[PDB]
Design a protein around this ligand. Structure first.
Ligand SMILES: CC(=O)c1cnc2ccc(-c3cc(Cl)c(O)c(Cl)c3)nc2c1N[C@H]1CC[C@H](CN(C)C)CC1
Length: 313
């Protein structure tokens, strides 16, 4: 059905979630045996939103990072688009916050530093996410955060998280992270309403309830981030070494990628070459074209698998 080219490389399991655009399916890469998440999108249903998909894809191909969900493979058929992705079995941050009611300040800070690491890195590559919220943050197996959903990425998004300058890009991501921070620590939104007009007025007004359990430090950070005028809003630079962010850390936030593809792994390349019937030298030329085809998927999946084993050795 144009699924059958995909079934060459993967065997599909159950649907794990949906979004406006896409169905997400658990899958297994047959050759490596690695679990993956596959994002299936119908081009005909996408309709006039198709360019956002091509923005999403080009962005994910340019980002490689510990807190950004890795893309392994992009397949296009007549009707569908498939994105093969890192499987994050922990689910959304949103569900976690709800299971705890709210997070302790100390725990908020662990989460927040990983968000900041990912977000500062996204910016260092010239993007703005524009849809930061805890539905778009996932825990992988190690309980580490991965940022997802780059469809509104720019080189928009939910209203409750949207910056006032945007409802009428670096500064805007700071506003949304400000909203995130409120939710982690409080368990509800600073601006909420059943009426969008009422909600809009609350956002522009910029006044929210400050609960008793918050620290003065965190309160101040909130007001620095939740400045309505982007000019007065705190910059990313200063967020990265902010005193609250560093409380009880000798390490300010390391946003740089710990996972560049500096050079090719011998074990992985060797393994690839045997299956592919080519020498390691030939295979090294092939991999470096980086087409996010099946060769790319298999190399990256093999690398992901090696890294996992090496952590228990
Ligand atoms: C539920 C689960 O356990 C799980 C496990 N592993 C994953 C691995 C990658 C992606 C993924 C999803 C989207 Cl929509 C992306 O754009 C990207 Cl880049 C990755 N999602 C999941 C994943 N996501 C589900 C499916 C629905 C999606 C929901 N809304 C868009 C809010 C997010 C939650």
């Amino acid at each position: 059905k144009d699924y059958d080219e995909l079934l060459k490389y993967y065997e599909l399991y159950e649907t794990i979630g949906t979004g406006g655009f896409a169905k997400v399916k658990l899958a297994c890469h047959v050759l490596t045996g690695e679990m993956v998440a596959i994002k299936i999108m119908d081009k005909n249903a996408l309709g006039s939103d198709l360019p956002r998909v091509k923005t999403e894809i080009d962005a994910l191909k340019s980002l490689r990072h510990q807190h950004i969900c890795q893309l392994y493979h992009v397949l296009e058929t007549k009707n569908k688009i498939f994105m093969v992705l890192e499987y994050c079995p922990g689910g959304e941050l949103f569900d976690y916050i709800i299971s705890q009611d709210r997070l302790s300040e100390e725990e908020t800070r662990v989460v927040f530093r990983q968000i900041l690491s990912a977000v500062a890195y996204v910016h260092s590559q010239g993007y703005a996410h524009r849809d930061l919220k805890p539905e778009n943050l996932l825990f992988d197996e190690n309980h580490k955060l991965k940022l997802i959903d780059f469809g509104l990425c720019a080189k928009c998004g939910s209203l409750a998280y949207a910056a006032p300058e945007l409802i009428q890009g670096s500064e805007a991501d700071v506003w949304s992270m400000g909203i995130l921070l409120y939710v982690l620590m409080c368990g509800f939104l600073p601006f909420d309403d059943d009426n969008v007009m009422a909600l809009y007025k609350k956002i522009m007004r910029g006044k929210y309830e400050v609960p008793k359990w918050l620290s003065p430090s965190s309160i101040l950070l909130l007001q620095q981030m939740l400045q309505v005028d982007p000019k007065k809003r705190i910059s990313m630079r200063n967020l990265l070494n902010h005193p609250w962010v560093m409380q009880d850390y000798s390490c300010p936030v390391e946003w740089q990628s710990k996972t560049p593809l500096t050079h090719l792994d011998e074990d992985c390349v060797t393994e690839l070459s045997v299956h592919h019937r080519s020498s390691r030298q030939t295979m090294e030329d092939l991999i470096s074209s980086w087409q996010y085809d099946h060769l790319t998927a298999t190399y990256l999946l093999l690398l992901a698998k090696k890294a996992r084993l090496e952590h228990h050795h």
